Design a protein around this nucleic acid. Structure first.
Ligand SMILES: Nc1ncnc2c1ncn2[C@@H]1O[C@H](COP(=O)(O)OP(=O)(O)O)[C@@H](O)[C@H]1O
Ligand code: BEF
Lengths: 539, 93, 107, 95, 80, 98, 88, 107, 93
DNA sequence: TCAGGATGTATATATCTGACACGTGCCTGGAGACTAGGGAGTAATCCCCTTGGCGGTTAAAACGCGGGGGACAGCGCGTACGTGCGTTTAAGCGGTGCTAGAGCTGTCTACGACCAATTGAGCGGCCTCGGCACCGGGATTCTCCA
DNA sequence: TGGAGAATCCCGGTGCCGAGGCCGCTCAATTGGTCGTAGACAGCTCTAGCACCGCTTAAACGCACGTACGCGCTGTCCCCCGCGTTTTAACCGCCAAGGGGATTACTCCCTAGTCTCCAGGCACGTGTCAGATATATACATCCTGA
């Protein structure tokens, strides 16, 4: 079709940002896709500016072919403010209505159904769009934008079925992560995009036809050709150069006395789900209710109760001394509460957006993230790493190492972003000889399944049986790492500049082990099994 | 015709318990009714326990489960102890 | 060989052969295990011994050397667990437990 | 002359020590035969059958009177009244 | 032929005394006679049904015991 | 002055409303937690089907409703309209549960 | 300020709240309720549940299972003279 | 000889053969007569028809056309004999009968 | 595997009684429980009736006596008449 | 408040008396030995469903306050129930007599178990539309302060 | 002393999901024989249930009196209900993992069934002591008066 230049968007209302070459290519791609089919997937990598491309598409089809109809945007609660700010920053010619609030304000906005194009873009979230689906089923929307569209991974989702029966002309999905965590999830995305072509009945065909795991150019090229007119991925390495590079550094740690005691106790003796209790024990014992000496005061006993917390405090002292602002991600909210109490003790300036905080406190927290010279950024992986711009910090530290790698990847990408100036140093804290190591390796194995397809068509367990060193039932505390902590992290002027005892680098390098000493488990569980005329009234 | 009862066994147990105490005939008939009633309770509970699990054999495990279901509190523990002791002594011979 | 009753092997006084026959002839299941009669006879003997212990104590409290239904009633209704076991059972010629309410007494 | 309530307590103690039957044999037997004539004519009764019926009936009535006394005391009374019997039987589930 | 009046007032008083009752209203006697009549009617109906099933013309003690056991009132000391 | 109802009118309205309906009157999660806590005292590491807890809740609510009916009769017997713990104790005594 | 533990002290029997007990009493026809009824009702419910759950767990352990089914509860209730219809 | 079911021979809509199999597999007696399953199936059909007719009347009284557990509960508890038959039975999602005592109503 | 019930027979009886009324699934499960409960009550009563008289056969006489023992009032009389009619019709054919 | 009397009740000794405990003969039911077959233990597989957590809304629970109505204590009265005495009735006990019916025995015979072949009734799976649930609106009802 | 206000009911509209009808298949009910034994029937015995009579005396009955208890009334006060505001956790959508329930195949050992033999237990007879009854006798207890 006809190419769109930057001056067309300049005249048509887009006045904020000067676009980029790949952004302009994406806008033209979106325009031609809108002109010929029903739906697409703008799957650029995180931090490349998908929101700018969608706003440019709105400006285009609102001032070129006069498609003046309503646009619906669905996004998580934490990026609602970002959408609202950028919508009026870049495209102030379109009136945007943030359809949020309690039931009463949403009803008062229900009453504004005068239908005189008083709103061009309606902005809401998943939960609201699922609670008020009936009101949001009576509009002829032209474009439906689902930001962070990897929530539609499961096809039996209520959101999938609810959004499928909408009067949308063009469904646009935004997803930064490599969607292909499993073939069925990618097929669910495709079935949402093109429900007629990709029928839900062909799930078995899609999985069977593409069981290939090697290069296999004969089928890799086939699937690439299949996904040519639907998906559009651009990576920072090939597109967004000249950005400071990120260097992931995984750091190992040991245990503590009571940590080993409870680790072995759960491994031997609610305990219906074992994996959750093991991970809880590795993170911090104090989040068990029965192990606290019930002191209702802060103190210094917190650091020695966990090796992970000890190493974290060492890292935090080093980073604060070196002048580094840091993000902090975790899975369980209890561990975040423990970190918040520790930060309050040590007098660290911290901010906390956690999920189940509120709608507006997140906006205030994001403002303070960058306004004040605040040091610690407390975050939850699922409710903090989904689209917030936190470029002020330059160090991402994971204390969780959750199951699938996409969450951690996108959480890390929250700091490696367009507009970053310093280098980003990703830090992981996984315990040595622990179930955390197995979760990490299982995640790493799951991750390099989508790397294969990208590079080809786009470019005994719960043990971890080295418990012999965990059968010492001591501390195994680290103090030599203090002099090497500058060796792993070479800080220059406000930047981080350019596999031994407790550290390992990540440059697409692998790690493996074969769980040597299960004899400890067997022996200590054998120890575990080692641990007439009745006339009840008379004896 | 001959009619059977538990009189001689009740008397043997009584001589074990109280070596110099007797018992009248009305009390003996009451104890016979008691033994029959408890037998029927336990046997019926074991029968329906075996039917619930689609089995066709009444074993000592089902008798033990019926004893735990019927007898209250501290009576069940001692009864289970005596039953287990008797079966262990019986199978060793 | 020399015969020897199953009760002697089990060390019991209640009959194991008779309990086995009653279990077989009561239409309780298609088959009856070998250890079911022994367990059941042991349980019945233990319960009989408990009742007789308490009833003999009650008879000795009244300076009697023979057990009558009144003594069985006192034994059963004074013990809590035997009272739960026999809560819906009537003992003939047993009477009741002496008990007057606190408000009916003069004061 | 004794004050009202003393002979009652002596009777309570006396009849709670004893175990004999408190209803006369012949009137009860006649009542049983009269009731049975409404189900089948020209029946016969073993003596032990009537004895068992009398024992069961007296145990039932004594238990009902215990419940009635509890219900009467509940209402700050010492006299049992028909409404107490009705309440006891309804709570037991017989009404 | 009014054999329910053979359950005399002194007999009902003795039953109440064994039940622990200290003072009795004057309307208790007719209520107790009605209650006893109902109880006896139920038990005797069941016993006569058992007797008729066995094609007998004599109500035995075991019929009464089975009727009482069926109504949830086990009776000890009359055989079985 | 605002509108107020006399004491006892909303009580009768609630009586009619709740005797007309059939839904469960206890919250699901607290009851399930209580059931699991009680069951921990018999065998550790037990699992429950959802229909097992549903059956337990139905039985418990029916039991409590019947007990409250008997309690109300016992309270009316004493010329009261307020039910008190002694009425519950009397009802359970007459039932044969103490 | 002790934000890491300030919620877990509710004693699950207290999850049977006063409004729930009032709703049960209303369905039972009760017009006015004393203030000491709630603890008495909680104790009664706890006793009833202990009996039924003990029987159900016994039935479950006999079958050598680790999951308490609805049939175990139905058998435990029929065991106590309380037949329940509608759960198989 | 074309097979004719025993239910049709008796004139019933309940399965005589299934009832016979259930009688033989329940350990109720050693052997089972020929007319026992027919008589039992007739009784079961009668009781089913009674409750269904009462519950249908109850459902129609509510301007509905499908029987739900509430209608079964109303039918059972409003009948004087079905209530005695099902006195110790709880019907799930059944509710109670609407009944307020007279002393609680206003003067 | 499969699971047998009384649903189709209950439905046929319902369409005899109320030709235009339907039934939900919870009500059908309640009716199935009712039929099973009544079946086991009558069968157990007939079983112990046969045991009392030293018989080994459960006949229609035992079922009739069990119905008369278990059902109250008019329910027993009508049930007996229906069962007798069914047996008489089955025997002549 | 204590003294004392009349009543009732526990206590000690003597004397029957009949029921319990023991010994005997025998017979039938339990024990020993053997064989055959099927019920149940056991290993392996699979996939359903159970548990634990987070995220976010929102309805219910909790807290506090004000007042009125119900619980409870106290008082008076009058009636109905307990107590005691003299009269009457019928229950209890014994003894005799008669026979109806329960109980046991022996002899068939018809009926129910068992088995093999066969086919239709019932069960699982799959649409699909109408009954019911939610919803907004108007109208009548019932309560409460005049 | 009627009107204001909150609650509930009747009416209309929509939509949605679960009850109902169809369909294919498979396994369980039916049919047809054959056997063996449970039960029906006839007969004989003997016991125990019913009926009656006569006498004794214990218990029921009727009556009178007086007292204490049930019941109605009144007054106080405090506690439970109704209602408004805040806050909390129930509930539902969603994501993970993995344990355990459910099925199948195999085999082996445990129980039923039969025959033989013999000792435990049951019916029967017999003596003697535990307990019931009687009579004196002391002691506790209730009640009234000074
Ligand atoms: N042309 C541009 N120039 C500068 N910054 C841009 C441009 N386009 C997008 N961005 C940055 O992208 C951020 C938001 O875009 P976002 O959708 O988060 O990118 P991504 O999709 O890569 O995560 C904003 O902070 C904005 O500064
Ligand atoms: F993918 Be952008 F951070 F919304």
């Amino acid at each position: 079709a006809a190419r769109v230049q930057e001056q067309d968007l300049r005249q048509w209302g887009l006045t904020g940002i000067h676009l980029r070459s790949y952004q302009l290519e994406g806008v033209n791609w979106l325009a031609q896709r809108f002109h010929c089919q029903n739906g697409c997937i703008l799957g650029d990598e995180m931090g490349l500016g998908k929101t700018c491309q969608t706003i440019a598409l709105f400006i285009y089809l609102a001032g070129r072919l006069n498609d003046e109809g309503p646009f619906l945007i669905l996004c998580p609660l934490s990026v609602l403010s970002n959408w609202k700010e950028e919508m009026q920053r870049f495209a102030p010619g379109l009136s945007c209505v943030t359809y949020a609030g309690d039931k009463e304000e949403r009803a008062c906005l229900q009453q504004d159904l005068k239908q005189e194009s008083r709103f061009h873009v309606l902005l809401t979230t998943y939960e609201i769009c699922l609670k008020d689906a009936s009101f949001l089923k009576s509009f002829p929307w032209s474009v439906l934008v689902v930001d962070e569209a990897h929530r539609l991974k499961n096809q039996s989702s209520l959101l999938h079925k609810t959004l499928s029966e909408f009067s949308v002309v063009f469904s646009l999905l935004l997803t930064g992560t490599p969607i292909q965590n499993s073939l069925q999830e990618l097929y669910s995305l495709l079935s949402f995009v093109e429900p007629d072509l990709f029928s839900k009945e062909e799930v078995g065909d899609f999985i069977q036809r593409y069981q290939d795991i090697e290069k296999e150019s004969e089928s890799a090229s086939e699937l690439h050709k299949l996904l040519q007119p639907f998906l559009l991925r651009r990576v920072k390495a090939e597109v967004a150069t000249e950005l400071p590079k990120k260097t992931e550094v995984v750091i190992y740690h040991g245990m503590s006395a009571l940590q080993k005691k409870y680790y072995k106790a759960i491994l031997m003796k609610k305990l219906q789900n074992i994996l959750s209790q093991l991970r809880k024990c590795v993170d911090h014992p104090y989040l068990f209710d029965g192990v606290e000496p019930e002191p209702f005061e802060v103190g210094d006993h917190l650091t020695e109760a966990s090796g992970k917390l000890h190493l974290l405090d060492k890292l935090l002292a080093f980073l604060y001394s070196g002048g580094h602002r840091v993000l902090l991600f975790s899975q369980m909210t209890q561990m975040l509460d423990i970190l918040q109490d520790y930060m309050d003790y040590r007098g660290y300036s911290y901010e906390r957006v956690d999920g189940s905080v509120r709608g507006e406190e997140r906006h205030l927290a994001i403002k303070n993230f960058g306004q004040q010279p605040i040091f610690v950024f407390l975050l939850s992986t699922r409710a903090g790493g989904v689209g917030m711009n936190l470029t002020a910090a330059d160090t991402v530290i994971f204390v969780d190492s959750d199951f699938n790698p996409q969450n951690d990847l996108q959480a890390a990408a929250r700091a490696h972003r367009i507009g970053q100036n310093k280098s980003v140093k990703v830090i992981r804290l996984i315990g040595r000889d622990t179930v955390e190591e197995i979760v990490y390796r299982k995640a790493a194995s799951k991750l390099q399944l989508t790397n294969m397809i990208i590079e080809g068509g786009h470019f005994e367990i719960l043990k971890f049986g080295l418990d012999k060193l965990l059968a010492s039932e001591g501390s195994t505390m680290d103090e030599i790492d203090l002099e090497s902590i500058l060796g792993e992290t070479k800080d220059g002027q406000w930047v981080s500049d350019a596999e031994g005892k407790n550290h390992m680098y990540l440059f697409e390098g692998k790690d493996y082990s074969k769980e040597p000493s299960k004899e400890d488990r067997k022996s200590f569980e054998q120890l575990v099994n080692l641990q007439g005329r009745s006339l009840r009234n008379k004896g | 015709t001959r009619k059977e009862s538990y009189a001689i066994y009740v008397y043997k147990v009584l001589k074990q318990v109280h070596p110099d105490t007797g018992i009248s005939s009305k009390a003996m008939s009451i104890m016979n009714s008691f033994v029959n009633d408890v037998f029927e309770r336990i046997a019926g509970e074991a029968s329906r326990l075996a039917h619930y699990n689609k089995r066709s054999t009444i074993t000592s495990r089902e008798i033990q489960t019926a004893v735990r279901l019927l007898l209250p509190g501290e009576l069940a523990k001692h009864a289970v102890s005596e039953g287990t002791k008797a079966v262990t002594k019986y199978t060793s011979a | 060989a020399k015969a020897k009753t199953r009760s002697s092997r089990a060390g019991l006084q209640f009959p194991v052969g008779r309990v086995h026959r009653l279990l077989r002839k009561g239409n309780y299941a298609e088959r009856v295990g070998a250890g079911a009669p022994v367990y059941l006879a042991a349980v019945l003997e233990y319960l009989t011994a408990e009742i007789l212990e308490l009833a003999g104590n009650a008879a000795r409290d009244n300076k009697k050397t023979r057990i009558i239904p009144r003594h069985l009633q006192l034994a059963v209704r004074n013990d809590e667990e035997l009272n739960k076991l026999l809560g819906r059972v009537t003992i003939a010629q047993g009477g009741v437990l002496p008990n007057i309410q606190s408000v009916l007494l003069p004061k | 002359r004794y004050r009202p309530g003393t002979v009652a307590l002596r009777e309570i103690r006396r009849y709670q020590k004893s175990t004999e039957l408190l209803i006369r044999k012949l009137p009860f037997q006649r009542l049983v035969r009269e009731i049975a004539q409404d189900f089948k004519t020209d029946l016969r009764f073993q003596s032990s059958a009537v004895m068992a019926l009398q024992e069961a009936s007296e145990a039932y009535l004594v238990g009902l009177f215990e419940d009635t006394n509890l219900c009467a005391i509940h209402a700050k009374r010492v006299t049992i009244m028909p409404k107490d019997i009705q309440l006891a039987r309804r709570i037991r589930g017989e009404r | 032929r009014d054999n329910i009046q053979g359950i005399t007032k002194p007999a009902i008083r003795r039953l109440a005394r064994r039940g622990g009752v200290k003072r009795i209203s004057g309307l208790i006697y007719e209520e107790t006679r009605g209650v006893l009549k109902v109880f006896l009617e139920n038990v005797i109906r069941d016993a006569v049904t058992y007797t008729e099933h066995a094609k007998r013309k004599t109500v035995t003690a075991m019929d009464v015991v089975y009727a009482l056991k069926r109504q949830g009132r086990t009776l000890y000391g009359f055989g079985g």
